[PDB]
Amino acid sequence: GASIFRCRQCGQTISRRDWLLPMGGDHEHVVFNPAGMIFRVWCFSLAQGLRLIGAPSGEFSWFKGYDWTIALCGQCGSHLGWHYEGGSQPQTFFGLIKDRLAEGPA
Ligand SMILES: COc1ccc([C@H]2CCC(=O)NC2=O)cc1
Ligand SMILES: [Zn+2]
């Protein structure tokens, strides 16, 4: 019905509703970057079709204990969110910008 998440700009397969991850009790986190941009972030245990840019950085990380790398759509290059690593339980996860994805059938 609506179990697959694709890149909104090009349709690249990214994630699934089954792979949503409740972090802090909720898979949705609203955050701001240092430029004041608001993001409605959904946390996923797993994702595909991305391209992770650069090396991890902990600066300004919204999630305690985690370092982030920019995650672009591997197909069109749109900024879809961030990959997080270096933490504990889980050690890694994806934070994806909800409004840059499109939900649909398998
Ligand atoms: C270009 O400067 C920056 C620096 C950091 C950020 C994001 C990265 C992800 C995160 O967890 N927290 C942030 O604030 C956005 C833009
Ligand atoms: Zn794309």
TrEMBL record:
Limits of the CULT domain: 2-105
UniProt-listed InterPro entries: CULT
Gene Ontology MF, one: metal ion binding
Annotated residues for binding of Ca(2+): D26, E28
CDD domains (UniProt xref): CRBN_C_like (cd15777)
Superkingdom of the source species: Bacteria
Keyword hit for Nucleus: no
Residues that coordinate or bind Zn(2+): C7, C10, C73, C76
Alphabetically ordered keywords of this record: Calcium, Metal-binding, Zinc
Protein name stated in the entry: Cereblon isoform 4
The organism of origin for this protein: Magnetospirillum gryphiswaldense
